[PDB]
């Protein structure tokens, strides 16, 4: 279920990284990882494309990388609008998609 | 290419020898195919035609 810190802290202007770690057969063999922000009381949002790409008309403040059998969301300076639950998903075993639990971002 | 994730199984028939056959194909649908650049192809056919 894509091992992930439940929460991350950080004051405005601080650059944080949220990582998800899985098995090497799921994560390492295919570069298919996504990141979805769900702002409290809303539906999920689509903000990261492929392993390190961005959708159409999305800010460049988030990026990513895959290192070994884990990947991380590269986040620029924080602010009051970044208080949301981030989720990560990636290619599963055979023809399924595995998703994590969440990272509750707490802006200090 | 043959794009479809395929599996294999085998069956022992009597003594010794086993037989192999396709086990499953986990969900999607295949099309066997061959992609060739058209550019190069047209260039070739006319050069042949010239000679």
């Amino acid at each position, epitope marked *: 279920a894509l091992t992930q810190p439940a929460s991350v802290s950080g004051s405005p202007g601080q650059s944080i990284t949220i990582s998800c770690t899985g098995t090497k057969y799921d994560v390492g063999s295919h570069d*298919l990882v*996504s990141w979805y922000q769900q702002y409290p009381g809303k*539906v999920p949002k*689509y903000m990261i494309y492929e392993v390190n790409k961005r959708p159409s008309g999305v800010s460049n403040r988030f990026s990513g990388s895959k290192s070994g059998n884990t990947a991380s969301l590269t986040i620029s300076g924080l602010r009051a609008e970044d208080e949301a639950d981030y989720y990560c998903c990636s290619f*599963g075993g055979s023809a*399924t*998609v595995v*998703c994590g639990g969440g990272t509750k971002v707490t802006v200090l | 290419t043959r794009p479809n994730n395929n599996t294999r199984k085998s069956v022992r028939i009597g003594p010794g020898q086993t037989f192999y056959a396709t086990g499953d194909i986990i969900g999607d649908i295949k099309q066997a195919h061959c992609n060739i650049s058209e550019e190069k192809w047209n260039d070739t056919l006319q050069k042949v035609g010239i000679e």
Partner: nanobody
Amino acid sequence: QVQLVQSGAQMKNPGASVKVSCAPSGYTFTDFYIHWLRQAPGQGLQWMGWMNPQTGRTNTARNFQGRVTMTRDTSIGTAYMELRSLTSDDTAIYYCTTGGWISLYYDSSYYPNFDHWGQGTLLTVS
């Protein structure tokens, strides 16, 4: 842009066999793939299954082999789920999405790229 349309409230006892619809509005229903997800209160996003609206072929998660069936109806352009043998532990928020593009040359069913989201429906079993 496109807007998905989901079903309404469903209140049932254990052994419900709930039918959940999702009718897209804007894109051709037989163009992109369909994924269903569940989000229990407190848990994260749990993927249920995908459907190919072209030929009806699906594949679900490992823990639903028997409880969750998914069918298409391409006359209207919607999709139907049937949630068999539900208990009170299955009280969760369900999401309808739009998956990748159906091609004739490569598999793109498992791509986790979920561009659009429905508004979300809650089932209560009690």
